Design a binder for these strands. Sequence first.
DNA 1: CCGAGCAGCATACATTACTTGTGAGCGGATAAC
DNA 2: GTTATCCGCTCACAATGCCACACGCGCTGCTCGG
RNA 3: ACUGCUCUUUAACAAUUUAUCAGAUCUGUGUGGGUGGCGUGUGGC
Lengths: 267, 99, 178
Amino acid sequence: AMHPMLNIAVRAARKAGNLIAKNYETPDAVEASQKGSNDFVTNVDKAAEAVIIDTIRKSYPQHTIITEESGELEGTDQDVQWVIDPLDGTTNFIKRLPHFAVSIAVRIKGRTEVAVVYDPMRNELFTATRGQGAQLNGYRLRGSTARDLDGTILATGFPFKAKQYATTYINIVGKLFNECADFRRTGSAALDLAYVAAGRVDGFFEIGLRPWDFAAGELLVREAGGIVSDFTGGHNYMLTGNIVAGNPRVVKAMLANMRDELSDALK
Amino acid sequence: SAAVKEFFGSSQLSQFMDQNNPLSEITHKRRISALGPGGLTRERAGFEVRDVHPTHYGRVCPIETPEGPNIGLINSLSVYAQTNEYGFLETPYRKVTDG
Amino acid sequence: APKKRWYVVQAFSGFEGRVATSLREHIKLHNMEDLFGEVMVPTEEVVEIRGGQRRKSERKFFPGYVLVQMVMNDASWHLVRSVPRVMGFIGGTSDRPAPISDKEVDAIMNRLQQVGDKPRPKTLFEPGEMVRVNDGPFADFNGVVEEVDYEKSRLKVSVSIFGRATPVELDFSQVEKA
DNA sequence: CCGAGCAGCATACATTACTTGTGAGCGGATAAC
DNA sequence: GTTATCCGCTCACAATGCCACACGCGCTGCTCGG
RNA sequence: ACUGCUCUUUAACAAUUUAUCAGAUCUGUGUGGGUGGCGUGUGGC
Ligand SMILES: [Mg+2]
């Protein structure tokens, strides 16, 4: 069968992504406003978040919801959370760069149970439910079977909100460029995690990511053979926002390589 | 029924008859074993038990025994041998009077 | 005033009720109708009146265990243990039992009260899971449970009727797997 | 009302059973400051 | 007394290779079933 | 027995700010696909 809450979540994400695509072909209807560093937030964010909240409350009028905009909407219950990003890579949707996704995951007792990301431009639908795995449009996902830091591709993100680490970050990337083959940068954390779980990139890492920008992808890469961690091998990545993810070999190699280049503030 | 049937059917001692030859049949019926429940096993047998004891004369054959991992454990009971009332191996003997 | 604190004994797979009967019989033997006052084996009932299993089913709060209201004396210790088929006690170190605390006592008591008041159909359906239909009028359909109900117990279910999805009130008996 | 599956059961107990030969960790007795 | 020392106590852990043959392989009263 | 006494002539609209001159392909079903695990015992060498 199909996990129930997963079905509700994927239906909601489908509707949100259809609205996204609708707003895409109209470079007039987008009416954004700047909120952070070198990025806007659009009315489309509000519209999609509204659609998602409504579709969720239709079949779940009591579940807690979490979103970058609405913070934490505490439903009458507080054990079932829905971490939502109606857009990952709003910067790209501003410039209409066709690479973004909607992201929806469900936490039970603090543990992520189901998760979906949806790229409406390529109509890709990364689903993943705990104990059953991750699927791409009906194909299983095993992540890149690479066994070392050679020939690999490394997805990353530059900290446009915390540019202080940049220098350090730069060194890190520099060190990594000594061994790895090439990097990837799409400005979309969720899709980076998906591609990792998709075996399209053989490893991902980012300094200072938002909690609701990986809580869906992390279950994908988990149930797709990959593992996630902070930059020191611990599990505090959910608070620090410092993520590394990929198949165990490449993650171990990256951590061994970065143990020195890193800074004590991050560890 | 379960106990008696599992005994008569699947026993460490009971086994299909070595029925390929009259002599084989007989010697397999009147065969004396030292293994089985309440009896030692071939692993912990010890070089001491297998050897014939000078009292084996007439009560248990000393020449017929399977060669290999169980020598002296399996034994063939002597021709004239016969179990006692209590269960020992009594052998006939000719009574000699004075002369 | 030493109250008979409750205790628990580990029974076998499915002999709990029979063990309790035999324990009451051993009580009547040793006349310890005071020390072994109460002995209880809780249960539950799931009532799905259609689809194979018919009209009821009996569950247990926790199998393999039986609850008593004994006291602490070595004689009563053996009298509990000297019954047909029980393992040892379940508590502190063996030969020195420990009582299930009064908080847990009243907790399990409230659970027993709730299960005794309302015989309630369990094996429910969760909002957002696909499911077939065994209804006459709607045979061999399949839809998603758009909203679940318990007292009304009629499974608001969306399904493709005249194209677009429509909500229906197909009752429990007309609901297939999950 | 009994036939056909099931879930966790040393059958509840005293089951049980002489040496096997060797190393190795361990707990109660022991010499010394 | 204590601190290190030592000696008997108990438990883990090994037992040639093959071949062939034979035999067997839960159950059971609770549970699903009409 | 004892509220009720015309209200006046069928819907009252969405699409909406650069940029345009409208601007290669409808073939299959050639071909394969369609006893054993363990335990124990017994013997042999
Ligand atoms: Mg976002």
